Design a protein around this ligand. Structure first.
Ligand SMILES: [K+]
Ligand SMILES: [K+]
Ligand SMILES: [Mg+2]
Ligand SMILES: [Mg+2]
Ligand SMILES: [Mg+2]
Ligand SMILES: [Mg+2]
Ligand SMILES: [Mg+2]
Ligand SMILES: [Mg+2]
Ligand SMILES: [Mg+2]
Ligand SMILES: [Mg+2]
Ligand SMILES: [Mg+2]
Ligand SMILES: [Mg+2]
Ligand SMILES: [Mg+2]
Ligand SMILES: [Mg+2]
Ligand SMILES: [Mg+2]
Ligand SMILES: [Mg+2]
Ligand SMILES: [Mg+2]
Ligand SMILES: [Mg+2]
Ligand SMILES: [Mg+2]
Ligand SMILES: [Mg+2]
Ligand SMILES: [Mg+2]
Ligand SMILES: [Mg+2]
Ligand SMILES: [Mg+2]
Ligand SMILES: [Mg+2]
Ligand SMILES: [Mg+2]
Ligand SMILES: [Mg+2]
Ligand SMILES: [Mg+2]
Lengths: 71, 88, 129, 85, 122, 222, 33, 104, 211
RNA sequence: CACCAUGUU
RNA sequence: AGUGUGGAGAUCGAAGAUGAUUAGAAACCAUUGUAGUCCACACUGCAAACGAUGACACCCAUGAAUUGGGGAUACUUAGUAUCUUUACGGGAAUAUCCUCAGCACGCACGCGAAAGCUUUGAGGUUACAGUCUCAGGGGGGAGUACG
């Protein structure tokens, strides 16, 4: 249920502002926590230097050695 | 003249559904519970003539057990049933 | 508590039409309720109705002809200009060929078609069809 | 067939059973009686649902006893419902 | 156990319905009758049918049997059924008066025809 | 080859009843699919299989698999029918679902969005059909809009003769068993809404089984 | 059985573990401040 | 999960009362609310038919005219105890709503 | 339904018709009453049983007779009974009126299973008690068949269009109710004149034990 | 109403 | 439940003890027993603190009951008793009918994913608007960390 009053716009504005934070997608865009933890820093690509070649095993039920590098 | 028309006066309705005489409700093609009761008309002498009175009762009314009361109301208005007895 | 007499009245009539009653009693009544009823009466959606005086907010007995599919009030009143008539018809009316939106205007309480003819806006009161 | 009940004009059967505030137009259930003194023959008007005990203005003793509903008139006194209007 | 299957019971009921007059309370004569009025490979089934056929005949003597329809016996019951008494039952009560309750008395008084002539309050 | 077993079917074979509207007018149940075949002109009736999916019943020795088949029928002129049947074989279920669709044929009322020029092109008023959690809402649209609907409702609306309509669906619309029936239920509601042009009362006709009762007595006797 | 599948230990005993863990962390910060 | 009983297995409607004081089960002593416990009032004979006839022979007071005393006791059980002692058994879903108002 | 367009008093209940009604307790209720059956009750006795208004009992009876008479093809009316007391009564009603009839257990699917080979399609259904003939009424609700019922004071009126308020528990009362219905249909058809009393005994309508 | 723990992906 | 200070301390009884059972059993069972359980005063503010269902108001079909207080004994008015009865006594309880308020039962629309709800709504909602307010936005991490 919700308020319906003609002069209750302030309550409806406050309600939407508080509840928009519950949306994980909306919160991620309006918070800097994701960008600070993002290695690219919000960029589409990033240049780097190969440190070593490593083999990563596929998750169950797959069985493989996915070839990766440390950058 | 009941139904949908254009400016050319072409009745574009596929058909005109029956209207219930008690509830003024359109009777759908898949009611399967709406009934049609014909009551014969009596002449001066206590013998039926060749004419009958037809009533339409919607199916939903019968499921509620209200068709009997509705038919009583309809027959009284139509002049078929006596509502109350006369003076002794 | 009861905050809208018009909303209570229209809900009572709409519920009675759903159950296929021939008559319905409205309590309480007001000038707005009578004006709304007369608009439906003019278009043939309700029959005769009688206002009963009890030296208080009166009561109304309404005769129903079975042609009213649904009537209801719009809360809040939601001011409607002459250019918003089609928007309200698109949102709350089943079709453009029938059904009315009742508004309260400086010229009085009237349906949307009559108000559009007189080039007046106002506040939306309710609807019926 | 039976007579359907008109909401605007209810039959006396249904309206009589209704609560006073549930009638088509609400109204009182109470009335006033002319009570003569059991030993004075002086007439005093007494409310049917009186809750304050009523004296005979010359007799100066109780005429009715308060109850949860209608008042209980004293023994051996005449009374008659005064017309409502 | 010795339970007659639906194959035996259905055949026995058919035999009685069509050859009731030629059947008896004795298994051995009924077996001879059944032998030439039925077609079957199994001698055991015919013997079982003869056993249940004799059982039905004993039941039929004591009274009607459900599932068996003898057309001749249906007439005779429907004959004595439609033997109306010299007077209708409504006549005896009407000529002796009808006793009705006080509530019924008030109903009749308000009718157009009034109180029936031969009706008296209890 | 067809020997009618119902009074309605006997009249149809004898051509005493010639149109589906007479059956629809008196709300007569249809128990033989050959009635629809006769009353609908050759080539006018089109059918199409909408969905076939398997259903499984667990058993002690594994599980039992049957196939549920959905069939749509119509003439694109205000008649639509939906049938769903389950069979051990896909072909058997497909054939049974076609018969079921003809038995559930309903009339569809068509109207105009704005001006009444030409033949009706849309539904006359807003209707919602519900089946399970799936609800399909049809809204009248102007000419040239087309059927703005999901591919499953769009095919059903095409078979019913609706040209322009706005559609909105809610609930688990991927449940196509319910999505198909929800659209069908909305179309069935078109001839149920009391519109002001239907306010005038009509003279009650006679049941065709009543009107030809004496002829039907002859066929039953013989 | 009265509840649905927990996917873990009994939640009441999980709560007791957290309470005991919270208490231990509270005392550890007491001896460093 | 799903609500098994509209009653919730007791005799306490939503707005009748808050707390009913528990009672000890007749067999195991489990504390169960008095409105929820399965309650049986049993009248038990002190001796069986064979034993009653033997004691009556040696009794100048008890005989054909004077009945021997009985045992009167109201027994309230825990749910588990009532199921185990077979005073109450699980019923089909349809028959669960059958209620008895007198000893039968 | 005595109200005729002319206004003659021919169909009104007479003393002879009324006298037979009270004779075998056709007006006595079941001590239990239903809301839909309330309008047909005149009052309650000291014993506790309800009394059926004979004016409205007669008015419904004429309405039922007129409906059956309007059926141009008899055997389009099926009269059903399940309580074993209408078995003789419905059988005798079929003879003088020419309607179909059935007694005992109603076979489910009789009106709906089109390949049953016992499939029948009556246009009007008559039952002796809605409570015991519920299967016939329920089936009729799927194939557009109006129902005429003999209803006592506690009767479910679901899918019942013409209700005749009468005692449907007594052997005599059931026979009387069908006897009047059989007589009225013939009078309405003109088969038997309204002046000469009918010569067919109501005792033949009565259910006597088949011994 | 003694004691009946477990089963590689 | 727990905490503080005074009381009280029969019963039962976290901790603990002993005896069994067991592969193990400091678990279930047996015998005990501390804190508690009880009271006064002062803290704590958590419960499946549940109808897992916020508050106020409107409409809403049927049958049998129950608690408290009253009234009666498209119609112009429609019945009836029983028991006790020298002082909390012009009494008390009953029977029939009506009524207002309260906890509810079997059960018509309608609603719902269903289980089920139904004048006691979870009904009167895509034909979406009586008023206010609280909370929720895949599962975990976590009602954790920090303040
Ligand atoms: K295991
Ligand atoms: K706490
Ligand atoms: Mg809310
Ligand atoms: Mg379990
Ligand atoms: Mg469970
Ligand atoms: Mg859960
Ligand atoms: Mg865990
Ligand atoms: Mg309370
Ligand atoms: Mg509690
Ligand atoms: Mg219990
Ligand atoms: Mg292990
Ligand atoms: Mg202390
Ligand atoms: Mg072990
Ligand atoms: Mg260890
Ligand atoms: Mg040990
Ligand atoms: Mg040990
Ligand atoms: Mg120990
Ligand atoms: Mg130790
Ligand atoms: Mg909490
Ligand atoms: Mg709870
Ligand atoms: Mg509550
Ligand atoms: Mg909570
Ligand atoms: Mg709460
Ligand atoms: Mg109380
Ligand atoms: Mg009371
Ligand atoms: Mg909304
Ligand atoms: Mg989440």
């Amino acid at each position: 249920t919700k308020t319906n009053g003609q002069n209750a716009a302030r309550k409806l504005v406050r309600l939407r502002c508080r509840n928009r934070w519950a949306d994980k997608g909306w919160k991620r865009a309006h918070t800097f926590s994701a960008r600070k933890a993002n290695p690219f820093g919000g960029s589409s690509h990033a240049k780097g230097i190969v440190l070593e070649k490593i083999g990563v095993g596929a998750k169950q039920p797959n069985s493989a050695i996915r070839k990766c590098v440390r950058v | 003249t009941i139904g949908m028309f254009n400016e050319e006066g072409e009745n574009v309705d596929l058909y005109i559904p029956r209207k219930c005489h008690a509830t003024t409700t359109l009777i759908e093609a898949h009611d399967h519970a709406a009934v049609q009761i014909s009551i014969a008309n009596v002449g001066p002498n206590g013998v039926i003539n060749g004419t009958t009175t037809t009533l339409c009762i919607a199916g939903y009314l019968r499921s509620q057990g209200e068709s009997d009361h509705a038919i009583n109301h309809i027959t009284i208005d139509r002049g078929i049933m006596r509502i109350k007895t006369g003076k002794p | 508590t009861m905050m809208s007499v018009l909303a209570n009245a229209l809900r009572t009539i709409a519920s009675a039409e759903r159950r296929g009653k021939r008559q319905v009693l409205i309590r309480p009544s007001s000038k707005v309720v009578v004006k709304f009823l007369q608009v439906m009466q003019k278009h043939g959606y309700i029959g005769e109705f009688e206002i009963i005086d009890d030296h208080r907010a009166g009561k109304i007995v309404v005769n129903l002809n079975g042609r009213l599919n649904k009537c209801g009030a719009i809360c809040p009143r939601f001011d409607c200009a002459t250019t918003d008539y089609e928007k309200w018809m698109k949102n709350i009316l089943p079709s453009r060929q029938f059904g009315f939106v009742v508004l309260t205007t400086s010229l009085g309480i009237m349906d949307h078609e009559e108000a559009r003819s007189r080039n007046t806006g106002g506040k939306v009161l309710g609807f019926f069809y | 067939g039976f007579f359907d009940a008109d909401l605007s004009y209810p039959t006396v059967r249904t309206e009589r059973m209704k609560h006073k505030r549930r009638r088509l137009v609400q109204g009182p259930n109470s009335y006033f009686m002319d009570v003569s003194c059991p030993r004075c023959r002086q007439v005093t008007v007494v409310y049917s649902h009186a809750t304050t005990s009523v004296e005979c203005k010359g007799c100066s003793k109780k005429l009715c006893r308060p109850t949860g509903g209608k008042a209980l008139l004293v023994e051996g006194c005449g009374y008659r419902r005064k017309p409502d209007h | 156990g010795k339970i007659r299957t639906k194959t035996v019971k259905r055949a026995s009921r058919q035999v009685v319905e069509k050859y009731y007059s030629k059947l008896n309370f004795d298994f051995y004569q009924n077996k001879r009758v059944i032998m030439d009025v039925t077609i079957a490979e199994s001698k055991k089934l015919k013997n079982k049918i003869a056993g249940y056929t004799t059982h039905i005949m004993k039941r039929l003597a004591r009274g009607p049997v459900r599932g068996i329809s003898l057309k001749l016996q249906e007439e005779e019951r429907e004959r004595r059924m439609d033997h109306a008494p010299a007077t209708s039952d409504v006549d005896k009560v009407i000529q002796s008066g009808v006793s009705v309750d006080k509530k019924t008395m008030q109903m009749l008084q308000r009718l157009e025809i009034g109180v029936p002539r031969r009706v008296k309050r209890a | 080859e067809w020997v009618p077993c119902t009074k309605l079917g006997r009249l149809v074979k004898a051509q005493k009843v010639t149109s589906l509207e007479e059956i629809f007018l008196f709300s007569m149940p249809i128990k033989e699919h050959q009635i629809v075949d006769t009353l609908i002109a050759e080539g006018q009736l089109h059918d199409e299989m909408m969905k076939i999916y398997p259903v499984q019943k667990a058993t002690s020795a594994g599980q039992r698999t049957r196939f549920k088949a959905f069939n749509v029928v119509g003439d694109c002129d205000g008649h639509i029918g939906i049938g769903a049947r389950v069979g051990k074989e896909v072909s058997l279920a497909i054939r049974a679902s076609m018969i079921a669709a003809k038995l559930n044929i309903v009339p569809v009322r068509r109207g105009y969005w704005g001006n009444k020029i030409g033949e009706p092109h849309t539904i006359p008023m807003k209707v919602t059909g519900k089946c399970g959690s799936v609800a399909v809402r049809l809204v009248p649209a102007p000419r040239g809009t087309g059927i703005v609907a999901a591919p499953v409702p769009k095919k059903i609306l095409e078979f019913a003769g609706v040209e322009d309509v706005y559609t909105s669906s809610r609930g688990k619309t991927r449940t196509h068993g319910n999505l198909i029936m929800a659209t069908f239920y909305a179309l069935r509601k078109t001839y149920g809404f009391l519109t002001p042009d239907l306010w005038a009362d009509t003279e009650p006709s006679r049941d065709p089984t009543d009107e030809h009762a004496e002829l039907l007595a002859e066929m039953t006797t013989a | 059985g009265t509840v649905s599948r927990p996917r873990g230990m009994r939640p009441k005993w999980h709560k007791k573990r957290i309470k005991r863990l919270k208490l231990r962390r509270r005392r550890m910060r007491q001896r460093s401040k | 999960m799903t609500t098994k009983r509209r009653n919730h297995g007791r005799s306490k409607p939503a707005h009748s009362r808050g707390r009913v004081k528990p009672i000890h089960c007749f067999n195991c002593g489990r504390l169960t609310p008095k409105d929820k416990a399965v309650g049986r009032f049993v009248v038990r004979r002190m001796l069986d038919a064979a034993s009653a006839r033997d004691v009556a022979e040696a009794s100048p007071v008890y005989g054909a005219n004077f009945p021997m005393p009985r045992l009167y006791m109201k027994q309230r059980f825990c749910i588990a105890c009532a199921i185990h002692s077979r005073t109450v058994r699980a019923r089909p879903v349809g028959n669960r709503k059958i209620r008895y108002t007198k000893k039968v | 339904m005595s109200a005729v367009e002319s206004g003659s008093k021919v169909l009104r209940m007479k003393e002879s018709d009324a006298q037979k009604l009270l004779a075998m307790r056709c007006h006595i209720g079941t001590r239990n009453q239903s809301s839909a059956m309330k309008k047909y009750i005149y009052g309650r006795t000291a014993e506790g049983s309800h009394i059926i208004d004979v004016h409205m009992m007669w008015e419904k009876l004429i309405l039922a007779a007129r409906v059956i008479a309007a059926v141009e093809n008899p055997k389009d009316v099926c009269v059903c009974s399940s309580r074993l007391y209408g078995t003789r009564a419905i059988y005798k009603f079929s003879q003088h009126v020419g309607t179909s009839f059935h007694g005992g257990r109603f076979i489910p699917g009789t009106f709906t299973n089109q390949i049953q080979k016992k499939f029948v399609q009556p246009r009007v259904l008559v039952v002796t008690d809605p409570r015991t003939d519920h299967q016939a009424i329920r089936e009729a609700s799927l194939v557009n068949i109006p129902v005429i019922a003999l209803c006592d004071t506690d009767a479910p009126l679901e899918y019942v269009d013409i209700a005749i308020p009468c005692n449907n528990r007594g052997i005599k009362s059931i026979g009387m109710m069908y006897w009047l219905l059989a007589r009225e249909v013939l009078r309405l058809r003109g088969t038997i004149v309204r002046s000469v009393p009918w010569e067919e005994k109501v005792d033949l309508f009565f259910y006597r034990d088949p011994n």
